[PDB]
Amino acid sequence: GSNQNNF
Ligand SMILES: [Zn+2]
């Protein structure tokens, strides 16, 4: 899967 982190 793809992953995204929005801090
Ligand atoms: Zn993955």
Short mmCIF file of N, CA, C and O and ligand atoms in Angstrom, two decimals:
data_model
loop_
_atom_site.label_atom_id
_atom_site.label_comp_id
_atom_site.label_asym_id
_atom_site.label_seq_id
_atom_site.Cartn_x
_atom_site.Cartn_y
_atom_site.Cartn_z
N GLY A 1 0.85 -1.22 0.00
CA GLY A 1 0.00 0.00 0.00
C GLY A 1 0.86 1.22 0.00
O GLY A 1 2.02 1.16 0.40
N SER A 2 0.27 2.37 -0.30
CA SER A 2 1.04 3.59 -0.19
C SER A 2 0.77 4.23 1.18
O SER A 2 -0.23 3.91 1.83
N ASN A 3 1.68 5.09 1.63
CA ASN A 3 1.56 5.75 2.96
C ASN A 3 1.81 7.25 2.89
O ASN A 3 2.68 7.66 2.15
N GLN A 4 1.10 8.06 3.67
CA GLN A 4 1.31 9.47 3.76
C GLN A 4 1.19 9.94 5.23
O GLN A 4 0.23 9.64 5.93
N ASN A 5 2.15 10.72 5.68
CA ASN A 5 2.17 11.29 7.00
C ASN A 5 2.10 12.83 6.89
O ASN A 5 2.93 13.45 6.21
N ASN A 6 1.08 13.42 7.48
CA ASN A 6 0.89 14.83 7.50
C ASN A 6 1.10 15.35 8.93
O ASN A 6 0.19 15.31 9.78
N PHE A 7 2.28 15.72 9.23
CA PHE A 7 2.56 16.23 10.58
C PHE A 7 2.02 17.60 10.78
O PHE A 7 1.96 18.41 9.83
ZN ZN B 1 2.77 -0.65 1.01
#
